[PDB]
Amino acid sequence: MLPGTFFEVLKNEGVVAIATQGEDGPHLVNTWQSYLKVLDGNRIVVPVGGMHKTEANVARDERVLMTLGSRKVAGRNGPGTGFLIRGSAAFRTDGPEFEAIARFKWARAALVITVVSAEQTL
Amino acid sequence: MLPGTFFEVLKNEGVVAIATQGEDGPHLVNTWQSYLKVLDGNRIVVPVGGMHKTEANVARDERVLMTLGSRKVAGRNGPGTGFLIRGSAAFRTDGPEFEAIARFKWARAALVITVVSAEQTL
Numbered sequence: 681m682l683p684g685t686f687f688e689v690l691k692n693e694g695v696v697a698i699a700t701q702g703e704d705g706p707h708l709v710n711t712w713q714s715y716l717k718v719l720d721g722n723r724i725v726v727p728v729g730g731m732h733k734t735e736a737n738v739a740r741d742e743r744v745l746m747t748l749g750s751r752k753v754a755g756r757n758g759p760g761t762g763f764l765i766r767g768s769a770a771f772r773t774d775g776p777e778f779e780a781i782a783r784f785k786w787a788r789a790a791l792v793i794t795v796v797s798a799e800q801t802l
Numbered sequence: 803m804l805p806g807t808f809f810e811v812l813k814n815e816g817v818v819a820i821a822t823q824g825e826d827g828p829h830l831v832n833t834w835q836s837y838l839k840v841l842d843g844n845r846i847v848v849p850v851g852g853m854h855k856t857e858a859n860v861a862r863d864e865r866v867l868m869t870l871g872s873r874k875v876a877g878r879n880g881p882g883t884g885f886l887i888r889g890s891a892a893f894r895t896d897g898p899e900f901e902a903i904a905r906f907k908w909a910r911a912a913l914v915i916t917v918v919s920a921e922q923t924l
């Protein structure tokens with residue numbers, strides 16, 4: 681379901697934001713869009729170093745939001761675009777999904793987001 | 803509240819992410835770094851075109867989270883840094899906080915975030 685424009689965004693560096701439901705409000709953490717590994721079956725894989733609070737939140741409510749964008753990819757009405765992604769999250773520590781981010785020596789886990797929707801919001 | 807490194811990040815373009823508490827989970831929207839207008843007294847102003855869901859969320863829970871970063875500013879252990887900002891949000895349609903972003907003619911309002919903490923997370 682992830683569109684070509686999203687893959688264009690990934691050719692450019694930028695900050696990714698990942699929102700989870702915490703016990704007293706949202707939580708918000710980051711990765712780099714160059715770190716993202718996209719696998720078939722609508723999966724976005726993020727290398728996890730910290731994200732201990734994020735992981736605890738995901739254990740309670742698997743639903744996450746992710747945003748990312750680039751000034752270098754045209755939106756609907758000018759230069760620059762980005763996406764709101766909604767999906768379900770899981771944390772893997774062995775197997776192919778963990779192996780996907782094993783280029784990152786500092787990683788303790790792989791955050792696997794299975795995308796339910798992707799909305800180009802600009 | 804806001805450190806020099808945060809202002810260094812603002813010399814560069816990038817996507818800002820703003821999380822609010824929604825009725826059934828977090829909400830997450832964006833602006834551009836170049837749009838942020840920082841005022842005296844720890845205020846970050848964002849031009850608002852849409853943000854209707856975000857505004858409804860803020861009306862019920864004023865606490866928001868904001869992240870942003872840049873690969874072009876040194877973090878603690880290598881190139882690239884960013885911030886988690888926590889603050890209270892209000893929407894203005896007039897007065898000096900609105901006038902701060904009124905140059906954006908598509909702006910129906912100003913989102914004013916009064917910063918309570920700023921954490922460099924990389």
Ligand SMILES: Cc1cc2nc3c(=O)[nH]c(=O)nc-3n(C[C@H](O)[C@H](O)[C@H](O)COP(=O)(O)O)c2cc1C
Nearest residue numbers: 709710711728729730731732733734871884923924
């Ligand atoms: C630009 C940027 C990129 C980051 N990349 C990662 C990352 O790839 N993996 C990670 O675990 N934390 C990364 N961090 C730190 C996380 O945003 C977060 O602060 C940390 O993992 C703690 O997560 P938690 O608050 O859920 O415990 C990055 C921070 C910034 C500002």
Ligand SMILES: Cc1cc2nc3c(=O)[nH]c(=O)nc-3n(C[C@H](O)[C@H](O)[C@H](O)COP(=O)(O)O)c2cc1C
Nearest residue numbers: 749762801802831832833850851852853854855856
């Ligand atoms: C990179 C990027 C920058 C954006 N800049 C703004 C902005 O400055 N102001 C704004 O109201 N919406 C901006 N948008 C759209 C918002 O993220 C959001 O989708 C829209 O305001 C609707 O908000 P809501 O879901 O709270 O109703 C931007 C989107 C992207 C991807």
Ligand SMILES: [Cl-]
Nearest residue numbers: 750751815816
């Ligand atoms: Cl960008």
